[PDB]
Design a binder for these strands. Structure first.
Ligand code: SF4
Ligand SMILES: [Ca+2]
Ligand SMILES: [Ca+2]
Length: 344
DNA sequence: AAGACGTGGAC
DNA sequence: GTCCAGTCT
């Protein structure tokens, strides 16, 4: 019953829609930035980053024209940093190739780095009205419960089945609003735990609620335990208070972020002294830091730096006052905090 | 295919 | 502790 379902959903949306910062206009640049920031990141976390980012980068061209270091700093702490490297590249392409206009063609837009199926649907359906589905985790959960889809949603194929269902039940009249409303429904009503089925605008059309199994959907494979990785970190300061930091490679974990020199140890002090050579004191703190796919076990070693030559790349000698200008991962932000607390 | 890829809320 | 808010390879 598409029309009945749509009306109960979209009337709910008009009433309950959150007035979020990226909903102030249907501008493709701002829908694109927020769509990328929101990937694997909760709305409440994104709000301050979005506001600061758009303030610093009001247009696609200001983003394209900005130095990679400035764009990364604006992303500092949000996680999954290849999102912002892909976005930066993708806007650069859009300025270079397309004269600064965001393509409204799905296949041309998706050629851009970072633009996967959700981001295509989100930007094109809201900014330009293109009736492409925008299936995020919220939408998969909603559709799994509605149509009692018990397949693993982690499989790409399941996602392709959801995307077909959307095109069938979609309100082609108001696609942008249909897509936001499904997302918003999963965010506000059809939540992972204890979904508010009784309050839900579409309790009638839900096969899961009818069978009493809303809480058992969606079907998501259980995450496997992650590798543990010991990491020795040096905080090396000369007599002028300047600190040695380095820029990580553009490929892999925490790409192009700055860090304090570090070595995967699997004795730390010996490897660190050996690495920076190519004298440290005892450890001052040891803490863990989680990633999605591994856990760092960090150990911080204070050090003294005497200048015997030029500071070569990737390294840079940073006055303590100028550390604030570099983008560090959260793990190394804590390294610096613990080093400064110890110094007190 | 499924591992890589950050981080922080809410249970 | 578990869960979970997308894309590239
Ligand atoms: S009735 Fe419940 S399970 Fe079905 S769409 Fe609404 S909130 Fe989700
Ligand atoms: Ca794509
Ligand atoms: Ca690398």
């Amino acid at each position: 019953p598409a029309r009945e379902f749509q009306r109960d959903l979209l009337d709910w949306f008009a009433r309950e829609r959150r007035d979020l910062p990226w909903r102030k206009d249907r501008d493709p640049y701002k829908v694109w930035v927020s769509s990328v920031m929101l990937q694997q990141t909760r709305v409440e976390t994104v709000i301050p980053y979005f506001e600061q980012f758009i303030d610093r980068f009001p247009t696609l061209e200001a983003l394209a024209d900005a130095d990679e270091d400035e764009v990364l700093k604006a992303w500092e702490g949000l996680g999954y940093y290849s999102r912002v490297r892909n976005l930066h590249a993708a806007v650069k392409e859009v300025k270079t190739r397309y004269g600064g206009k965001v393509p409204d063609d799905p296949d041309e837009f998706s050629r851009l780095k970072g633009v996967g199926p959700y981001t295509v649907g989100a930007v094109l359906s809201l900014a330009y009205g293109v009736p492409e589905p925008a299936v995020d985790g919220n939408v998969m959960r909603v559709l799994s419960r509605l149509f009692l889809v018990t397949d693993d949603i982690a499989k790409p194929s399941t996602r392709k089945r959801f995307e077909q269902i959307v095109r069938e039940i979609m309100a082609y009249e108001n696609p942008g609003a249909f897509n936001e409303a499904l997302i918003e429904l999963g965010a506000l009503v059809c939540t992972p735990r204890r979904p508010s089925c009784l309050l839900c605008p579409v309790q009638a059309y839900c096969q899961a609620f009818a069978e009493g199994v809303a809480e058992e959907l969606p079907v998501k494979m259980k995450k496997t335990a992650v590798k543990q990785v010991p990491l020795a970190v040096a905080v090396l300061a000369d007599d002028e208070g300047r600190v040695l930091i380095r820029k990580r490679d553009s490929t892999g974990l925490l790409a192009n972020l700055w860090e304090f020199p570090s070595c995967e140890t699997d004795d730390g002090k010996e490897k660190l002294e050996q690495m920076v050579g190519e004298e440290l004191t005892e450890p001052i703190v040891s803490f863990e830091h989680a990633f999605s796919h591994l856990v760092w076990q960090l150990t911080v070693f204070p050090g003294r730096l005497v200048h015997g030559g030029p500071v070569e790349e990737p390294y840079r000698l940073a006055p303590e006052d100028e550390l604030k200008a570099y983008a560090f991962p959260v793990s190394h932000q804590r390294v610096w905090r613990e080093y400064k607390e110890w110094a007190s």
